Enzyme design. Structure first.
Site, mmCIF file in Angstrom:
data_model
loop_
_atom_site.group_PDB
_atom_site.id
_atom_site.type_symbol
_atom_site.label_atom_id
_atom_site.label_comp_id
_atom_site.label_asym_id
_atom_site.label_seq_id
_atom_site.Cartn_x
_atom_site.Cartn_y
_atom_site.Cartn_z
ATOM 1 N N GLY A 28 -19.169 -19.163 19.445
ATOM 2 C CA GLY A 28 -20.078 -18.107 19.874
ATOM 3 C C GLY A 28 -19.452 -16.894 20.575
ATOM 4 N N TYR A 64 -29.466 -18.024 16.468
ATOM 5 C CA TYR A 64 -30.512 -18.316 17.413
ATOM 6 C C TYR A 64 -31.823 -18.211 16.674
ATOM 7 C CZ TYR A 64 -27.200 -17.664 21.305
ATOM 8 O OH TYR A 64 -26.158 -17.808 22.215
ATOM 9 N N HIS A 77 -27.918 -12.377 32.669
ATOM 10 C CA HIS A 77 -26.488 -12.643 32.631
ATOM 11 C C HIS A 77 -25.741 -11.457 32.078
ATOM 12 C CE1 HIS A 77 -27.801 -13.375 28.487
ATOM 13 N NE2 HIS A 77 -26.539 -13.243 28.108
ATOM 14 N N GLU A 105 -22.041 -11.126 29.662
ATOM 15 C CA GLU A 105 -21.282 -11.958 28.742
ATOM 16 C C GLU A 105 -20.138 -12.641 29.469
ATOM 17 O OE1 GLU A 105 -22.453 -12.357 25.403
ATOM 18 O OE2 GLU A 105 -23.901 -11.561 26.809
ATOM 19 N N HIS A 143 -28.330 -8.514 31.264
ATOM 20 C CA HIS A 143 -29.443 -8.470 30.303
ATOM 21 C C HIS A 143 -30.232 -9.758 30.350
ATOM 22 C CE1 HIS A 143 -25.859 -9.724 28.041
ATOM 23 N NE2 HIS A 143 -26.633 -10.428 27.225
ATOM 24 N N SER A 146 -25.255 -13.552 16.701
ATOM 25 C CA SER A 146 -24.468 -12.811 17.688
ATOM 26 C C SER A 146 -23.075 -13.357 17.886
ATOM 27 C CB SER A 146 -25.201 -12.814 19.040
ATOM 28 O OG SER A 146 -25.402 -14.136 19.483
HETATM 29 O O1 LIG Z 1 -31.103 -15.608 23.098
HETATM 30 C C1 LIG Z 1 -30.685 -14.461 22.825
HETATM 31 O O2 LIG Z 1 -31.138 -13.737 21.911
HETATM 32 C C2 LIG Z 1 -29.554 -13.912 23.657
HETATM 33 C C3 LIG Z 1 -29.461 -12.560 23.928
HETATM 34 C C4 LIG Z 1 -28.402 -12.120 24.696
HETATM 35 N N1 LIG Z 1 -27.460 -12.926 25.193
HETATM 36 C C5 LIG Z 1 -27.556 -14.234 24.929
HETATM 37 C C6 LIG Z 1 -26.545 -15.066 25.469
HETATM 38 C C7 LIG Z 1 -26.791 -16.382 25.802
HETATM 39 C C8 LIG Z 1 -25.758 -17.126 26.321
HETATM 40 N N2 LIG Z 1 -24.535 -16.623 26.511
HETATM 41 C C9 LIG Z 1 -24.372 -15.334 26.162
HETATM 42 N N3 LIG Z 1 -23.160 -14.799 26.340
HETATM 43 C C10 LIG Z 1 -21.969 -15.581 26.641
HETATM 44 C C11 LIG Z 1 -21.660 -16.622 25.599
HETATM 45 C C12 LIG Z 1 -20.850 -17.706 25.869
HETATM 46 C C13 LIG Z 1 -20.592 -18.636 24.889
HETATM 47 C C14 LIG Z 1 -21.157 -18.455 23.647
HETATM 48 N N4 LIG Z 1 -21.946 -17.417 23.351
HETATM 49 C C15 LIG Z 1 -22.178 -16.529 24.326
HETATM 50 N N5 LIG Z 1 -25.332 -14.534 25.647
HETATM 51 C C16 LIG Z 1 -28.586 -14.760 24.166
HETATM 52 FE FE LIG Z 2 -25.790 -12.308 26.306
#
Ligand SMILES: O=C(O)c1ccnc(-c2ccnc(NCc3cccnc3)n2)c1
Ligand SMILES: [Fe+2]
Ligand SMILES: [Cl-]
Ligand SMILES: [Cl-]
Ligand SMILES: [Cl-]
Ligand SMILES: [Zn+2]
Length: 344
Positions: free
Chosen positions: A161, A168, A179, A181, A267, A279
């Site tokens: 990821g 998702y 959070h 990133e 965000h 993503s």
């Molecule tokens: O559900 C959604 O559409 C969404 C939107 C924005 N950010 C996230 C998200 C959720 C969790 N972690 C991260 N960023 C860090 C990360 C860490 C490990 C793997 N992927 C991402 N981003 C998820």
């Molecule tokens: Fe994110």
């Protein structure tokens, strides 16, 4: 005002070169909001059809339990048994979980914040995979060709990821908590199909103030881990942000649109109904300093930690020695565009 979320409409010629477009939107100030929308050319499509994915397996769906009050919440994940997209969709579109009736976004948003703790939905999160076809060379989340690739191509280190793609599958009221990133990287999010995803953003220049606020409301969590927001369990309503004077903006992403998040852009948001988003993270030269300064969670074991050494060595050779001695005191200016943006 110059920290409001911008939307961009590239031509196919501008769209072609990913890192170049990112540098362009930073020259227009897009990074200041922490989040930007890019609407691709109407010609461009990442996949021909989304009918052939009903057998795709979501290995680890999550039920999202949410506890709290007065605009402050904590989200707890209960993993459920594997299911297919077909089985997920049926639940998502069922009477129990489907989007409620509404007119304007404001009404749906009020329903989100009012019913957040009731009827826990299921989120088909963190599914390894891409829905792009192999031929698609523009904005291909599997292979963006940014300097983040140096993590793989200098250590074979793959971080699922982060330098690979996640899917998702959402339903109504499924949430992403506040959070930035991991390593304060950029992210890219493409909504393949379905109902919209709405987003909240805090300008990177006000990020610290959000952190001070969250520490005030969750002192126990902040005490066990300074970077507790990285646990991705903290939800905070816009009514509370406004009350405490934190600036933020909002935007709704529709199917076929990209959202970009920027280093240190906090965000959060929620899905309006059944949808699918892909993503991953990426980097530019501007990111390197954020990476070096990122405050990490060490209270949990598997947390994403990227060694900055390769980046500092290659792109900041003149600062490497000082940095390695722990004496690099570079202060980040969140308003400056990436070096790559001088062209524009
Ligand atoms: O559900 C959604 O559409 C969404 C939107 C924005 N950010 C996230 C998200 C959720 C969790 N972690 C991260 N960023 C860090 C990360 C860490 C490990 C793997 N992927 C991402 N981003 C998820
Ligand atoms: Fe994110
Ligand atoms: Cl200004
Ligand atoms: Cl259905
Ligand atoms: Cl390091
Ligand atoms: Zn932690």
């Amino acid at each position: 005002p110059s920290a409001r979320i911008m939307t961009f409409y590239p031509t196919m010629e501008e769209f072609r070169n990913f890192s170049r477009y990112i540098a362009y939107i930073e020259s227009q100030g897009a990074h200041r909001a922490g989040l930007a929308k890019v609407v691709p050319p109407k010609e461009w499509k990442p996949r021909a059809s989304y009918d052939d994915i009903d057998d795709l397996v979501i290995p680890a769906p999550i039920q999202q339990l949410v506890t709290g009050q007065s605009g402050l919440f904590t989200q707890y994940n209960i993993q459920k048994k594997a299911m297919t997209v077909r089985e997920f969709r049926k639940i998502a579109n069922s009477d129990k979980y489907c989007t409620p009736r509404y007119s304007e976004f404001e009404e749906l948003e009020r329903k989100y914040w009012k019913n957040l703790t009731f009827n826990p939905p299921i989120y088909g999160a963190d599914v390894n995979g891409t829905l792009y076809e192999k031929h698609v060379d523009e904005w291909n989340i599997g292979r963006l060709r940014t300097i983040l690739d140096l993590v793989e191509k200098e250590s074979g280190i793959t971080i699922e990821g982060v330098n690979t793609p996640y899917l998702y599958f959402g339903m109504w009221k499924t949430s992403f908590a506040w959070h930035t990133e991991d390593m304060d990287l950029y992210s890219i999010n493409y909504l393949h199909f379905g109902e919209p995803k709405s987003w909240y953003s805090v300008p990177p220049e006000h990020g610290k103030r959000l952190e001070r606020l969250a520490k005030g409301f969750f002192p126990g969590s902040a005490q066990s881990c300074e970077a507790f927001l990285r646990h991705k369990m903290t939800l905070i309503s816009p009514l509370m942000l406004k009350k405490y004077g934190i600036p933020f903006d909002k935007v709704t992403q529709e199917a076929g649109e990209f959202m970009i998040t920027f280093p240190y852009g906090y965000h959060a948001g929620f899905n309006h109904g059944f949808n699918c988003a892909e993503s991953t993270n990426f980097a530019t030269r501007r990111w390197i300093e954020y990476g070096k300064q990122a405050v990490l969670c060490s209270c949990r074991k598997d947390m994403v930690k990227i060694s900055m050494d390769v980046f500092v060595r290659k792109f900041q050779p003149e600062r490497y020695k000082l940095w390695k001695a722990g004496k690099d005191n570079t202060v980040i200016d969140h308003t400056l565009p990436t070096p790559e943006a001088a062209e524009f």
